[PDB]
Each structure stands twice: as structure tokens, then as C-alpha cells.
Ligand binder design. Structure first.
Ligand SMILES: OC[C@H]1O[C@@H](O[C@H]2[C@H](O)[C@@H](O)[C@@H](O)O[C@@H]2CO)[C@H](O)[C@@H](O)[C@H]1O
Ligand SMILES: OC[C@H]1O[C@@H](O[C@H]2[C@H](O)[C@@H](O)[C@@H](O)O[C@@H]2CO)[C@H](O)[C@@H](O)[C@H]1O
Ligand SMILES: OC[C@H]1O[C@@H](O[C@H]2[C@H](O)[C@@H](O)[C@@H](O)O[C@@H]2CO)[C@H](O)[C@@H](O)[C@H]1O
Ligand SMILES: OC[C@H]1O[C@@H](O[C@H]2[C@H](O)[C@@H](O)[C@H](O)O[C@@H]2CO)[C@H](O)[C@@H](O)[C@H]1O
Ligand SMILES: [Ca+2]
Ligand SMILES: [Ca+2]
Ligand SMILES: [Ca+2]
Ligand SMILES: [Ca+2]
Ligand SMILES: [Mn+2]
Ligand SMILES: [Mn+2]
Ligand SMILES: [Mn+2]
Ligand SMILES: [Mn+2]
Lengths: 232, 232, 232, 232
């Protein structure tokens, strides 16, 4: 079996295991702040430096993975709390879209909301142009921020949220369990064929964005990950 | 929302929140030993005392749940390491089958391998009579120990294993992630309609068993659980 | 070369290869519980029965050894988690100190903290009388629990910890690597001349203790050892 | 804390976590064969792809690490069993020396035996030009294959050898424990200041080589590694 696993309880600038793209900054408390509160259309992304091989063209096998992370979003004065965070999987050459308008593209798509990635978004602003539901929500995104499926959610300012994701290769099912501050859990699941949507080598990471009038604090506090590919 | 959540880092005899059935015993280190190494066809089960309402006949809603636990299985001299552990969900009136032969029934089914329950088994012995795969395995059981679906696995004597289970009401998908001792993960998922297979109120728990020649140490070390039912 | 090697994956009462002193007890899962949770100033020690010859008066050679073991410490209700575990090396006639107060003496020293032994301690309580650091710690002890050198550490209740110790005869260096639950490692090393501090024949083992208000579960799960003395 | 950890029970070609340099080849059984038996002055090296940050210029801290691996060396007909294997640490830009003569340079140094690296060698041939001891040996190399310190050893054809290395940042001590086939252990230790000999980011790996008349099978079977840097 081919296994990749890492665990981050705190991040630090200068660690070769992590890639920073955009307005990302590492706070003194070990947290990663994804966007810059003073920039228009800010965009920040963090990726695990080493590309992970999720499927083999030789065998035809796809990998299974278990990952969990916790984040925090907090409101700032005068600005609309937007736009959210997205945990994504993309090709190893992934870069912030050229001329990204930030906002509802979450730093992973173009103006139409199209891109090459698969991810789970924690959207805190309803962009009608992308057919966003009228409330905060969690959604599964396949090559577009126009979610394949969404579930109502509630973003609480200053609350630490915990997420657990499981991808079962056999069924090609991606299931998410979000544990809110008050104890309640929110789940969403969807069948996504990674082998057909992404290349053999990909990179995992987080991304967040803002606009001119919409800005808020987007923090990533911890992240653990394990993937196992059957090499036989 | 209707939520039930509990967390056990260690168990103790005399705690009204837990039900003991069969040869169960609570070790001094806080662990639960499911079977008696000196009894033929031993069977032990532990259940969470309070019944959980997984679905409402009024609304038609089914609950979602996130639960994780860790166990340990160790070999004893002269005996074949058998038969395994099973995390199950059954009616509130559930009791060890009358005249249970222990062994490959895992303490939840009759001689034919039939019973009323849904669970995830960590089977360490191949019972051909129940169509067991030729190797150790994890499997999804629906009213029978003749698994609906199985995946190869490897039980390591003395290794602490961690499991995470997510059930998404919407898709009715049960996904399992097993983190082995060496770091590799094993996953299995299957669509199971709880509302159609079980009654509104059920009880969750663990069960393990042995035979005459097959016995080993079955330990449950910790268990956390959270379920949320939409009451609207 | 003169070599002594053994490997214990589980312990059993009645095994002539092991010596039990004090409140030691062997659990049904094969683990050794060093202290009695119901006794004031409890003290328990386990020693390898056969004395090992660590140095020769004839040649002047000292032996080298490689040993690794894993333990677990868990909190009990109402009592302060104390006092810790110590892997020690002492004369073949070693016995629990007469009138031992348990507590911060770890079952190897008198009230002043003096004794005849060399060991590595995993101290979970700060005894100012022995100049303990303000936090949990690992330390090298030479004839006293007033550590020659210490390094900060963190004892996690219910966590299985793994330790690897290497003693290189040439440099007379004792190095320890502690692998915590979360993956991080803690190391400490110190030059200790065994030939000058201990007699030719010694015994290796573990020891743990408690007080009136301080008690917790001290478990030893496994232990392997190999020593080689150049006889030429 | 900043921690990097990985575990390889078997290797596979195509795994992005590993870098192959020279005549390296991955056998069907998952082993890595470092040299080509049919090439004159063959040289093969394998490196962990991700660079590890062993020290910080900001804080001044150096990391501690625990790593263990197992190898096998076997004789081939007509050729002298040479030259050996070396576990090394070098700058991230490390490449096989230009115009490497293989042989006694172990694929890490030039003709004079000089290079930029720190490593532990398992030398099976006495090169007088590098002041090699008259017997097989293990040695600590600092920027040269003219070992800073060596200890007698014995390479057994077809024997699986296990090695455990511990580097304690505080003392800057590198200690090695080699467990031979027959059970005896061999140890060697030496104080090496990584911060003064290597840059902040380095790569870890193995290397082996042969000559015209000296060739043998050099196999790497497994490798686990954990390093922890105090980021504070
Ligand atoms: O208001 C938050 C959202 O802003 C939208 O962009 C706004 C911009 O912030 C404001 O200055 C208004 O003038 O013009 C834009 C369109 O209304 C983003 O499109 C949306 O994604 C949120 O960030
Ligand atoms: O509190 C844990 C520590 O106890 C110390 O002994 C205590 C005793 O247990 C407590 O009940 C208090 O009454 O009296 C003693 C000291 O004031 C031990 O000395 C220390 O080693 C811990 O065990
Ligand atoms: O005999 C093993 C050693 O070979 C040395 O190279 C030899 C070469 O093998 C032989 O063909 C004759 O040509 O001369 C060379 C020098 O004696 C290597 O130098 C030595 O490192 C061993 O590999
Ligand atoms: O061997 C473990 C295995 O035993 C099967 O039952 C055995 C029984 O233990 C043995 O003593 C008897 O001689 O043969 C039986 C099989 O023919 C159980 O059925 C199986 O579940 C395991 O426990
Ligand atoms: Ca949106
Ligand atoms: Ca079975
Ligand atoms: Ca103390
Ligand atoms: Ca040589
Ligand atoms: Mn959205
Ligand atoms: Mn089965
Ligand atoms: Mn101490
Ligand atoms: Mn040499």
C-alpha cells in the first residue's frame, strides 16, 4: 500500500511542507490567515507541498482518504462577512486564477465560476450568479462553484468549527461531517469519481477570498490527513 | 434539532449510562473486555443505555450521526484468535440471541446468521457457513452476518485501531474509515435505509464472541457519539 | 560476544523470567499495572529475573544495549494524576526502599530522593523537594530522583507512548527517543559511566508510585531488550 | 512543533514521495536495489523527495530525529562483495558527484573522498586511500568518507540487518544501534553539529556503489522516519 499522512497542529512560515499562494499569512499563534483585510478582492491559498498520487493508470485503483481540519471565521467592522473557505483538490500545477475577482469564486474559479478542481465549500454569501442558496451553506463542488449539491448551514462569528471528510474509493463517495460550535452536526455526501475528474497527481489545500465590501477573518487552525492507495 | 451526544474516555462498572450483557467485564484500566477467555462460546455486549430516536414517523426524517471509537484485539496462547468485534444498531429490546453459539455469530445472530440489526464487523475468522471472505475483513451487515459488502483488512495483535463512522441521512450512506496501526487507512461504504430496516427507537453498542477453540482478547477503549435529527 | 535478549508482547503471572515487587498486578489483557489505585503510597516494580552482566572487571569492557518499550498512563476520578514511571538499572539485590513513602520517590529512592540506581523517569508531578521542573518531564537519574538533566514533556491520559533507549559503551552515552501520541518525538541524552556507578551484575525493570491524593493508572504494555558485551 | 514523519514498508516506482538517482531500481517484491550488477562503477541513490528543515536561522533551534531502516547485502558470483551502503543527509540540491568513480566513494564523494554530507556508512571493503580500517565496519562520516570514527562490524551475505538512529538536538549526539542477524548489537555514537555542517533545508536518503571488480546486491527493505523541530 502507498500511504501519505501528515498532521499540523500549528503552521509556521518557512516550512517546506507547505505552499503559500496569494495573501496568506501565518499569525504568531500558529494560525494561517487566508485573506488580507486591507486588500480589494483578496485571495489566499495554502497547499500541501508534496503532490499526492490519488489514482494509478497502471492498476486503475483510486485511493481512499481520511482528513479532518478546524477553521474559524470572524466578522470585522463595517464589512459584510464574506465570502468563505473551500477545501479543494486540484492538479499539481494549480495556481490562483489569472485576474481573479476574489468574491464568490473562492479563489478557485474564473468569473463564470468554472475551474478544474473538486472541493467542499463553506459559503457565507449568496451569489445568485452562481446559483447560491439563500442561506449559509456547505456544498460539494465539481469543477465549478455552482455546487453539485448543498445543505443549509450557519456560520457563527468567532466559533471554531471541526470537519471530518471520508472518501471511499470503492463507492467513490465523499462524505462530510461538520461539527458546529453548539454541538449539532451537519452532513453532506455525494458520489464523485476522482479518477475521471482529476489527473493522477494532485495537491490538497484550502482557499478563501473577499471582495471590495465583503471581507472577514478566515483562519485555518489544524489539519491532519491520511490517504492509502492499493498498489496491487 | 434533536441531538444526542456522549464521550467515553474510559468506562466504569456502575455507570447507569451503560448496559452490560453477557460476559462483559470492566478492567481496572478503564477498558471493557467483551469476552471471557475461560468460557466456551463466550459472548459479551455493551450498549448505550438510553435509546436513540433515529427516525420520526411524524415527519419522516432520519437522523445523521458521527461516531468514532478505538479497540484492541490481542492473541492468547493455544487458542485461535477469533472471532471479532461488531459495532451494531438494534431495537431497544435487543438481547443476546437465545442459545447463542458465540463463534461466527458475533453475538448478534442465530445459527443461520440471521438477526435484527445493522452493523460494521471487524471479523478475524473465515466462517464459510456465513460466506466469509478468506481473509480478515471489515464488512457492512444488514440483518445478517453474511455481509452485504466486505473489504480486506488485517488484524494486528496488540494494535490499537481507530474507527470513524459517518451516516448521512440524505443519501442514506454509511461510510467507515479504519486507521490501522501502521498508518494506512481502510474504507468501506454502503447505502443502508435505517428507516426501513430498524424501528424509530434503537440502541447502539458493541459485541464480541468466541468459540471452544477460538478465543482472544477483545477490548473497547473509548467511544464518542453525536446524532442529530431534524425536528421540522 | 556475550548477548542477552528478550521480547515481551504481553506479560503473564507465573512467568519465571519476571520478578514482581510491591503492588504490581497482571491484567487479563496481558498488561502490567504497576500501582494499586486503592492503596495509600502504593509502589509497584517489575524486574527482569535474570541479572545482566554490564561490565567485566577482567577486561574492563562495558556493554552496549538497545531497548524499547511502551506504556500508558490514565487519569482516575478525584485523584491527582501522579507520580509517574521510571525505567531503572540497579544492583541484583535491589528491593523497594524500606518504609517507602511512594509519591515523588518513584519507588526507587528514600525520602531525600537518594538511592542506588540509574534510570529514565517520566515524571507527571512537580516535587519541589526534589527540584522537579514546573511541568511534566523526562529526566536522566543517577542515584537520585533529583535529575541530572531533564527535558519538558506532556503526559496524555490514555495515550500509548513508545520509547527507544540506546547506550553506547564507547562514549558512555545514554540517549532516549520518546514518540508521543500525536507523532512528535522528544529526545534527551547524557553521558553516564555505568561501570563507575553500578556493579558488574545488575537488573533492569520498571517502577511506579502514588501517594494519598495522587494516583493514576500506570501500565507497561511491551518490552524488548538486547545487550552485547565484548568478551575479548 | 514542526514534525515530518513517514513510513515505507515497501517502495514502488512512480511514488512522488521518493527520488531516484543513478542505477536505482524497484524490484517486484517492493525492495529497492541500489546498484546495477552489470555496470562498471555503478552508483544508485534514493532520497526522500520533500526537503526537511533541520534547523531555523530565526530561532537557532536544531531538530531531533528518530529513524530506523533495514537493508540486505548479498554476494554475487565472481565479484568482490563491495562497496557498501550509506545513509546520508545532504543539501536539497544534492546530486551524484560528477564523474563519480563509484567504488569506495559510496556515491557521495569525489575521488579524494570529499563531499558535502553527513552520514553513517556500512562499508564492506577496505580502501586504504580513504584510511579504511582492515575489516568491515560502521562509521560516522562528516563531509568525507574518511570516517571521523569507526567500529568493527561484520557483513553477512543474505542477512537482513536492522538499524536505529537517534539524533538529540541538545547534545548534538548521533547514536546508532545495528542489530545483526545473529542477535548481537553494534553501537557507535559521535557529536556532530548539523547546524554548522549543513544548511537549513536538507534531504535524507541512501546510496550504494560498486567498481569494475567489486559488485554485490545492495537492498533497502523498509524505512520509517520522524523529526521534530521546536518552533518557539
Ligand atoms: O457584499 C459582499 C459581496 O460583495 C460582492 O461584491 C460587491 C462589492 O463588495 C460591493 O462594493 C458592491 O458594490 O459591488 C459588488 C457586487 O455587489 C461579491 O460579489 C460577493 O461575492 C460578496 O463578497
Ligand atoms: O498531590 C499529588 C502529590 O502528592 C504528594 O503527597 C501529598 C499527598 O498525596 C496529598 O494528599 C497532600 O496531602 O500531602 C502530600 C504533600 O503535601 C506527593 O508528595 C507527590 O509526590 C504527589 O504524589
Ligand atoms: O576489488 C573490489 C574493489 O575494487 C576496486 O577497483 C579495482 C577494480 O575492481 C579492478 O578491476 C582492478 O582494476 O583495479 C581497481 C583498483 O584495485 C575499488 O577501488 C574498491 O573500492 C573496491 O570496489
Ligand atoms: O477455530 C476458531 C473457529 O472455531 C469454529 O468452531 C470450531 C470449534 O472452535 C472447534 O473447537 C471445533 O472442533 O470445530 C469447530 C468448527 O468445525 C467457529 O465456528 C468459528 O466461528 C471460530 O471460532
Ligand atoms: Ca457564495
Ligand atoms: Ca467470521
Ligand atoms: Ca516528581
Ligand atoms: Ca571502503
Ligand atoms: Mn456557495
Ligand atoms: Mn465476516
Ligand atoms: Mn522528576
Ligand atoms: Mn569506511
Amino acid at each position: 500500500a502507498e500511504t501519505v499522512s501528515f498532521n499540523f497542529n500549528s503552521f509556521s512560515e518557512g516550512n517546506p511542507a507547505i505552499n503559500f499562494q496569494g495573501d496568506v499569512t501565518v499569525l504568531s499563534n500558529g494560525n494561517i490567515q487566508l485573506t488580507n483585510l486591507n486588500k480589494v478582492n483578496s485571495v489566499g491559498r495554502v497547499l500541501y507541498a508534496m503532490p499526492v498520487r490519488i489514482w494509478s493508470s497502471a492498476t486503475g485503483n483510486v485511493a481512499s482518504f481520511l482528513t479532518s481540519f478546524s477553521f474559524e471565521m470572524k466578522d470585522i467592522k463595517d464589512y459584510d462577512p464574506a465570502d468563505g473557505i473551500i477545501f479543494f483538490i486540484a492538479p499539481e500545477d494549480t495556481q490562483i486564477p489569472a485576474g481573479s475577482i476574489g468574491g464568490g469564486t473562492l479563489g478557485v474559479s474564473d468569473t463564470k465560476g468554472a475551474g478544474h478542481f473538486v472541493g467542499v465549500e463553506f459559503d457565507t454569501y449568496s451569489n445568485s450568479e452562481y446559483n447560491d442558496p439563500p442561506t449559509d451553506h456547505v456544498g460539494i463542488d465539481v469543477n465549478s462553484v455552482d455546487s453539485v449539491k448543498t445543505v443549509p448551514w450557519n456560520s457563527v462569528s468567532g466559533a471554531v468549527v471541526k470537519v471530518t471528510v471520508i472518501y471511499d474509493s470503492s463507492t467513490k463517495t465523499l462524505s462530510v461531517a461538520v461539527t458546529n460550535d453548539n454541538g449539532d452536526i451537519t452532513t453532506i455526501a455525494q458520489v464523485v469519481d476522482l479518477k475521471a475528474k482529476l489527473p493522477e497527481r494532485v495537491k490538497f489545500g484550502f482557499s478563501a477570498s473577499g471582495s471590495l465590501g465583503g471581507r472577514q477573518i478566515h483562519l485555518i487552525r489544524s489539519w491532519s490527513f491520511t490517504s492509502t492507495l492499493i498498489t496491487t
